[PDB]
Amino acid sequence: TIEKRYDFVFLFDVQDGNPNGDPDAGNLPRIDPQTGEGLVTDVCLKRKVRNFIQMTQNDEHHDIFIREKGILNNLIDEAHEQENVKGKEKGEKTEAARQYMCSRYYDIRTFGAVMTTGKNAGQVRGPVQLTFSRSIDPIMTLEHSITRMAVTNEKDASETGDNRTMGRKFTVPYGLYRCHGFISTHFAKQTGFSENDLELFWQALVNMFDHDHSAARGQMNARGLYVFEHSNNLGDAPADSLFKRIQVVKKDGVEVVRSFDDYLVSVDDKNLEETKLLRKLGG
Amino acid sequence: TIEKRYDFVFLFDVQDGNPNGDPDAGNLPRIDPQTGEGLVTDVCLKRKVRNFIQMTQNDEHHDIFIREKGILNNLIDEAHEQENVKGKEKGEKTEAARQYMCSRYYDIRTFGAVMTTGKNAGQVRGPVQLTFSRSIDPIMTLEHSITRMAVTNEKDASETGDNRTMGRKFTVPYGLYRCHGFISTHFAKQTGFSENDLELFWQALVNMFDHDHSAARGQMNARGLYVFEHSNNLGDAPADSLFKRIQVVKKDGVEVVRSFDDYLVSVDDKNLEETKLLRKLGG
Amino acid sequence: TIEKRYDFVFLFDVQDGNPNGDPDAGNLPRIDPQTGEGLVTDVCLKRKVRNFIQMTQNDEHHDIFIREKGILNNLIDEAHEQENVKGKEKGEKTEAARQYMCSRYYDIRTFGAVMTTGKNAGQVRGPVQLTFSRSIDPIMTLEHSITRMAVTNEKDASETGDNRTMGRKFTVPYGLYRCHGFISTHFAKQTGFSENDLELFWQALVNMFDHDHSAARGQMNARGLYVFEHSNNLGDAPADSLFKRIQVVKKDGVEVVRSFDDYLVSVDDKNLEETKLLRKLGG
Amino acid sequence: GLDRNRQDIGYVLGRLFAVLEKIQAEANPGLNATIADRYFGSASSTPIAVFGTLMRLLPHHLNKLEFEGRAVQLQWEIRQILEHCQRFPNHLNLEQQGLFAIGYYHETQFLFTKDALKNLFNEA
Amino acid sequence: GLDRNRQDIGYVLGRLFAVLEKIQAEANPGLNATIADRYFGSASSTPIAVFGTLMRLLPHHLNKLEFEGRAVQLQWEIRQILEHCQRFPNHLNLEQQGLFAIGYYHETQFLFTKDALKNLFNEA
Amino acid sequence: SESIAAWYDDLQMVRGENSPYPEYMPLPRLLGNLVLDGKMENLPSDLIAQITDAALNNRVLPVSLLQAALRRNKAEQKITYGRASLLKAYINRAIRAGRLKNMKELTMGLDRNRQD
DNA sequence: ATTATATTAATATTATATTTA
């Protein structure tokens, strides 16, 4: 179980593609309406970490939460028929099953999952809780509409021989999504989030943009990862100014940004040397 | 099934023509609005690879995804009436049909396809996932408007004299589209992407610009292909700096670029000799 | 149907006149803005080949695509009322009509045409696909403005004196347009491009600059035609270096070029003797 | 329902695309695929790539018209729109992305009218 | 709606093409195919190939005018535009490609006016 | 029946020819467009316990109707007869009760003006 | 527990000399 507080400043961008796209709006990434800054949900990073763990582990005591056919009720029923089948008086039986799943699953240990379906077994508050990403420069939506020379269903097929199904494939030129996140210790002591799991989560956050790739997302990479390791479980200084110390603004006289040569990540670690640490894993 | 990670740096240009045209803009290639760098989608390279396979194979267990006369629903129904007609309990039946299609089709094995139409059979995550290309020097659009001495339809535009239908045929003088792409292993082990299929895909990527040609695209060629072969399935170093080591900038005191004698592909393989390899297939 | 790959290096110049002139710019030939090299589209060579076939054939099974008085919809409707009027189920009916037109037309068999108007009948990918020409030495535009002693329409200049209508008639002093082109075999096997049609196309490319002449284009001739006949349908070596082996640069200490006595066509067939052939038809 | 003094870049850009589409439609009634069926897909995002060819094809579309005064009126309203368009931007913001279509359909409605465009042209 | 001190190459190039088209239109009202119907198709991409013949035909177009002072005013505004045009570029960027048409239609609007060009010429 | 008449006139929505939905929609059938799937998961304090009281007494409709109809409209990805009429009734009652200022009351047919 | 499915509008902006020891 970990005992220190970690305030990591995850920074990641996108070369050309659709990172965290919005089902609410067709196929465009989440962008700020009033300004234009791109937004990326934390569930995308969580799924990238899960895929990295699935491809760089394959062992027990670190379940990865299977895809599609993985019914949550079936997994809950399978985890219930272990040490606390019935002889535990429902109440503490749920807590025992939750502890067993935390010791067995890695997704529920690092983040969390819903285990209150049919056979209830409590819920996990979760230690590490990432936030929604947000860029600084107002990004623009390119919208790269592409075509296909093969129809899907015969009903929507044309009355001729030219069977085409176009559509749109949105893309993004740039946008350093300044992600945020905080890690607690009280819930980590209950879920069993040890330091080895924390190091594995850091390695996943660092090297998830090298394997989890597709045609819609294109090419994505992680810039830097400045973790603010504390000293105790108390609160020294508000995290607002702590995360504001690593500001990311524009460089010289430029309108937009295209790569890392147009951003100036101002890192001035001067007032955060009281009872806090600093490490660089991605940058 | 492959077991190594490949980070190829595909480099290809265009002599005179329209390479990857139209993000719904008439007939112009995809160019960066803020700067002017030309962009090429990965689906063009995928279709070139498919055409190369169709013209250099003609055998079973390597389906090429037919052109206009190929309804996806009909192909899915034909692939369903094989070994898992109904006696497989829908759930695992979809996975069995997906595995059969991966062992039979080459496009879904290397890249992927939508198999969730009428008779659903799951979906393929895809191992090899190319990205959108992007040039370095801001290219310019020539717009070579040409004419025709023969009208098409019998509308009112067909004058009594010269039945002409002009239009525009866009062209590009130069632009080394610095393409990118990553290859995974976890999905390759499920789809059956063996090393022979990987070598065939490399040969296709190398020799697709010699057969797949037209009048609109003109003459296109592939410069170099530097594949970064890893050693395991884990993540050694971020791919951002790995792809940044092979930078392509301007040469001496020149404004634009016309051919290979104006570019200086700086290749300094010095820090990538830890646990990675390097090979040259196109350059 | 042909089975070999042909990479011809078409070379042709212009004595005095406007070869491939640009409607986007008044009446000047297509020239490179950044440098000054003249450019010639492939449709001009295609039309010259069509005119040569029209004047050196006059027979069936080799349609020449008529000039001004040739509506494409009327020709498509005439070709539809043959063997597949309606009893063919639209889908394969389009393919049957396309095959019939390929066996009947020569322009669609060698190059291609749009047959997707009213009565759709598919489209032809086309085997032989020429590219846009480009010279080496930066040519200069002469602009030979000439006059006329006879007015055309009753405009505002035909007053009392000599009714004159001048204008400009652009000319070019020299410029060996290094044309390029590739021939495939997969599409040739479907369109029926036999070896006799290939020989006819070669003869047309050789002897099209002797009949197709006018006052605007002046005098044009074809220098040489080095066809790179392969051995199979696969890809041996990239065509970039193959076409770069026949370089055309300046001779001795001269600024520009006026005729063939100022160019030095360096032909060193040394490394192309692996699995390829070489023939000379025009030079 | 049209604001000609909004001083918004998206408004004037959309109005320009609308009058361009109107001119192309007036050039030939039997038109199958207009510019809106291809050029509008990237007009609000990459205007500097589509509006160049648009202005290149505009004079030929005006000459294709059977009436020469109609082309004069169309060019006049084009310039009255582009008065507030000091420059063609690289990419439009989300607000400007919406204002593009807003001005487009507003100018289309203002053009497809009985006595309106000619009435505004008479007071010039 | 015209910025004469923008110091942009596309702006002055478009203004020059606009005044050239205005001069050609003023040379003869019964003009069928103007320069914009042929020269504008490659004016923003290859200006060094079209603007040469444009400057070659400019003096004859000015001499074709019935009024000699009009040609003087047109040459004056041509040079006032080309003041910021230090050189004719090979090819314009996308931003410059848009600024070409921007300045073109801005100068066309500024020219097709009652009292504006002559008022600016009087203060010189 | 003045409260019922006002509630059904505020619930009066556009209907096409040969429509299965009646001129006046039942209250459980109307709430079924706001529940999860079956008319049983509604909130027994602000939905099936307060909407009936607000309709049978011509009271003010709560914002819970707005939010539930919005969630089920952008969730089911379609607006059938039931959710739009409820929102129209809410807007009309908020205009009539001062809980809505800049906007105005809606009519049965399509309002081609509105300017909202 | 659907509906529906055929074309608005189109005729001319502007147009008179910088500077010359």
Side-chain angles (χ1 to χ4, degrees), chain B residues 8-13 176-179 205-206 209 221-227 246 248 260 265 267 279-283, chain C residues 240:
Chain B
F8 65 99
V9 198
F10 194 36
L11 299 154
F12 64 100
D13 41 6
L176 182 58
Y177 301 116
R178 190 198 187 142
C179 176
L205 267 196
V206 162
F209 286 121
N221 298 267
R223 194 55 65 190
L225 181 74
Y226 304 140
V227 183
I246 323 287
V248 171
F260 194 43
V265 186
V267 180
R279 65 183 70 188
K280 308 179 184 55
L281 293 119
Chain C
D240 204 58

Side-chain angles (χ1 to χ4, degrees), chain F residues 22-64:
Chain F
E23 178 184 358
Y24 312 100
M25 194 158 184
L27 185 54
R29 202 168 169 256
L30 194 87
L31 297 153
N33 293 282
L34 325 161
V35 301
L36 231 46
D37 283 84
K39 201 255 170 178
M40 49 208 75
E41 282 102 7
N42 236 10
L43 327 173
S45 60
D46 211 4
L47 260 300
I48 53 174
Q50 203 151 109
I51 302 320
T52 161
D53 204 302
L56 287 159
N57 311 296
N58 210 358
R59 306 287 169 256
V60 183
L61 262 50
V63 208
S64 300

